[model samples]
Target: AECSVDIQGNDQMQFNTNAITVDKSCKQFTVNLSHPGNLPKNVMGHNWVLSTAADMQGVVTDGMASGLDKDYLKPDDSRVIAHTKLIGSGEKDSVTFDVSKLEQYMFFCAAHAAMKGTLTLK
Candidate 1:
């Protein structure tokens, strides 16, 4: 699988996958994100954000201040392990992170509360 995953977001506030497995043997892990819904960015923007489970709330809280221009993430926020830019219908983005440095991690959508996911590194 080359430590890569493709995820989809839709207007219904959902993701195609809720869990991802990354082999530790990989130097880097990549998340490819796409939004195929009909909604516009401001109404239904979705992004893939990775961080510790405990850090998720804080990351999301601060992200709101960063606004849409910054993909709903703080500028140069070290707490983020990796993240994709917010996308709307027909838009796409991807993010890659070093596997070796990671601890327990999770992925979620900053715009939608119920959209959550986990990343398991083996």
Candidate 2:
């Protein structure tokens, strides 16, 4: 539990969990994103984009505009600490990052700004 967390996204534009906690003892942490609906990527694509609370607005702004071609994220954007690939129904992805590089965080789907969650470093 300290190393990884499972998440779910659906066609309705929502993340199953609203909060996540990462233990400081772990050198690395993993965030898994899984789509559990019946939709195509272009219509209902989802991803796990991680950043600080202040960065979410800007990240989501640029990300959604960036288009699916770039997985809905800016190319090589340093604001994004880590992220998963764009995925459709029944698809899954895993994003792992160095724990020491992170502080309090938030994750969201680029295209759906409302689809987001909070993350805390413990």
Candidate 3:
């Protein structure tokens, strides 16, 4: 059976979960992100960004220039493994990528540096 997981980000600059795991049998994976804050998108939007561990810095810097409308993710950023659009409180967004695309990957909230975590495929 296909399974999906939810990750939550809040106004406090933290993620509800620190780690995530994908089953080996999963052919595809979806990460649903939810922001439970009261802040506006520009002031406190949150997005789920995925990329290789080594490329995190480049991804974040480039994304910073892209701004809120671009979900703070560079347009067609090749380094980005996958990402969800920026969302404010009471909003939701999801990103689905083939499990095969992620050999060894990590995901984090661009709005909050401390909200970092890894995704594992078995």
Candidate 4:
């Protein structure tokens, strides 16, 4: 079965969901990211970045310096298992990656400090 994760981010720098689970039967995992605010990308945009739980902070720190053109992510960042584009108000994006690559990964938004979640692969 395919798993779909619906995430919502707003101007307050908060995500609607705090955790996700991927069924082992899922060959691929899909993430639908949505920004429900009227603010600009610079003010309150959000993206989904997935990496090993242990690598979350390091990747986030580097992703910040990577600039927006790269979706606030480092160019060719090997640590990033998968990610979605940074989006603003009324904007949405999705990404599908092989679920087998996931290993207790961490998901978070670069635009919001302390906004993050965990992804578990069953």
Candidate 5:
């Protein structure tokens, strides 16, 4: 099976899981994000953004400046490995990245910094 996983975001500013695994056997890995909240994207929007755990804070800080138009991420931000489009309640979005990009990476919500997750490649 392709290496992929589904993630969920809710109105409480949280992801369903804090840990994710990607298998190196797959050429690419995909993260599917689902928002089951009742709020709108602007108020309680969420997106799945991936980068090294070390760069997460910077990326998120810059993303806040980039605003919602860019999914709360800077355009062509090299620090970002992959990210999904901003999503609202009951909406879905996905991002696929080469398995080679995997490292000591972390995943998070661009809209909410506290909503974070970890990724491990094996």
Candidate 6:
């Protein structure tokens, strides 16, 4: 609907939706992320990162160097197709990407490994 999705991240290291079906008819797609958890950002965080599947680990690696002082994601990552900032409880962020760039695409939470998901074509 509307080429957008509302996603949730929680204390248990989950994104609620493990797989996303993207309707390619739309020229653009949006990922709206919400962190509705009791846990603080210290132990864990909610991050929405989009890029090629192969590029996933590298992006997350960059964040490891970022540290808590600057949120959980790298500030600049060209390998990223589009991404939302790392967020904590009740915090939210959104990202929009051109559907044409969907090839080899994948999404994940740089905050937690369990949050990875695959998307494209519906």
Model 1 agreement with the true structure over 3-120: per-residue lDDT tens digits = 8999999999999989999987888988899999699888898988888888888888898887767776888788888888788999999888888668668889977746998888
Candidate 6's C-alpha lDDT? 0.79
lDDT of 4 by residue, 1-122 (tens): 64988889988889998889898889888999998979978778888888898898888789789867777678888998998888888999999999768646888886664889899977
Cα deviation at 111, candidate 6, in Å, is 1.6
What C-alpha lDDT, on a 0 to 100 scale, does residue 68 get in candidate 1? Answer: 69
lDDT of 6 at 14: 88
Quantify all predictions' global Cα lDDT against the true fold: 0.85, 0.86, 0.80, 0.84, 0.88, 0.79
Worst 10 residues of 1 by lDDT: 64-73
Off by over 4 Å in 1: none
lDDT tens digits by residue: candidate 2, 57-83: 888778778876787788988899988
How many steric overlaps are in each model, in order?
0, 0, 0, 0, 0, 0
Which pairs of residues have clashing backbones in candidate 6?
Answer: none
Our model 1 lands, by Cα RMSD against the true structure, at 1.6
Of 2 and 4, the candidate ranking higher by TM-score: 2
| Global CA lDDT computed for model 4 | 0.84
lDDT score of residue 73 within candidate 2:
86
For residues 22-121, what per-residue lDDT tens digits would candidate 3 score against the true structure? 8888878898999897987777888888888788878888877886566667889898878888888899998888877765678887766557888777
Question: For model 5, how does the per-residue alpha-carbon lDDT over 33-61 read when each residue is reduced to its tens digit?
Answer: 99996998878988888899999999988
Can you tell me which runs of candidate 6 are displaced by over 4 Å?
none
TM-score of each: 0.89, 0.92, 0.87, 0.91, 0.92, 0.84
Best-first order by lDDT? 5, 2, 1, 4, 3, 6
